[PDB]
Design a protein around this ligand. Structure first.
Ligand SMILES: Cn1cc(-c2nc(N[C@@H]3CCCC[C@@H]3N)c(F)c3c2C(=O)NC3)cn1
Length: 272
């Protein structure tokens, strides 16, 4: 079905990324006729996690989401995906500080379109950060890294985690921390942090702070300040994403429309 032939896969030595799972490496898959450049995640608990990740990716079909090519069991279990040559958004902006506001708005808007689709599909990402937005080009972003993602049950709007795993706490909404509940609204909170990272050219959020100090800050009603040069309209949107009460926080339909309209305003202004 989605099981690839190891003979048709050529892996490169140099690592693109790494973690607890293992590594991400560049490869080439011999297709129908052409050769396709690919990104390959290489590795008991990890196997099931990789299969689950593959199973989520298989179900998604959207221009702003990384597509899975297939899986392969060879020297290790491998998850073969589309290649995004310019790599993680945070690293790209760290290395390309000349990138313009309009360009950043374009890219975060593309993420909002991907997340709108994910929300409509009733999946929660649970790791939406600038490190997991990949650039195909300078004007084309895709959402990646679905290893923590969950398909929501038909009768529930949230996923309830059993235990506090190794979590990216600085991206998580209050209800994730306090109740272990993850919804599309919690992904919206994470998207606010992602926006902050993007306009801060890949700077880490809540710098110098422990997780428990971020909790205290958030409970005082405090939020990260506006990044230098970030348009006021985009900071307003970040703060709306950081609405404490999950019910009053906007969904991605509302977020995507705000971004779309502001982007077209900036596109008009730059013609003027
Ligand atoms: C040029 N380049 C491409 C990637 C890439 N990285 C992925 N995961 C990394 C895990 C470590 C943290 C940074 C990423 N989140 C990933 F899932 C995919 C890629 C890719 O091109 N397609 C899928 C990295 N560099």
């Amino acid at each position: 079905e989605v099981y690839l032939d190891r003979k048709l896969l050529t892996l490169e030595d140099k690592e693109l990324g790494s973690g607890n799972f293992g590594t991400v490496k560049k490869g080439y898959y011999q297709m129908k006729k052409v050769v396709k450049t690919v990104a390959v995640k290489i590795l008991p608990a990890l196997k099931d996690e990789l299969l689950a990740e593959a199973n989520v990716m298989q179900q998604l079909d959207n221009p702003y989401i990384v597509r899975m090519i297939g899986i392969c069991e060879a020297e290790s279990w491998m998850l073969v995906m589309e290649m995004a040559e310019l790599g993680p958004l945070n690293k790209y902006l760290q290395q390309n500080r000349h990138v313009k506001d309009k360009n950043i708005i374009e890219l975060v808007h593309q993420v909002s379109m991907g997340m709108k689709y994910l929300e409509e599909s009733n999946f929660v990402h649970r790791d939406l950060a600038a490190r997991n937005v990949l650039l195909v080009t300078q004007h084309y972003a895709k959402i990646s890294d679905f290893g923590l993602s969950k398909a929501l049950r038909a009768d529930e709007n949230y996923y309830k985690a059993q235990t506090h795993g190794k979590w990216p706490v600085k991206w998580y909404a209050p209800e994730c921390i306090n109740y272990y509940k993850f919804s599309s609204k919690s992904d919206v909170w994470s998207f606010g942090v992602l926006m902050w990272e993007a306009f801060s050219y890949g700077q880490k959020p809540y710098r110098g702070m422990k997780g428990s100090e971020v909790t205290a800050m958030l409970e005082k009603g405090e939020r990260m300040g506006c990044p230098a040069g970030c348009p006021r309209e985009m900071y307003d949107l970040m703060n709306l994403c950081w609405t404490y009460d999950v019910e009053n926080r906007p969904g991605f339909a509302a977020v995507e429309l705000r971004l779309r309209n502001y982007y077209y305003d900036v596109v008009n202004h730059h013609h003027h």
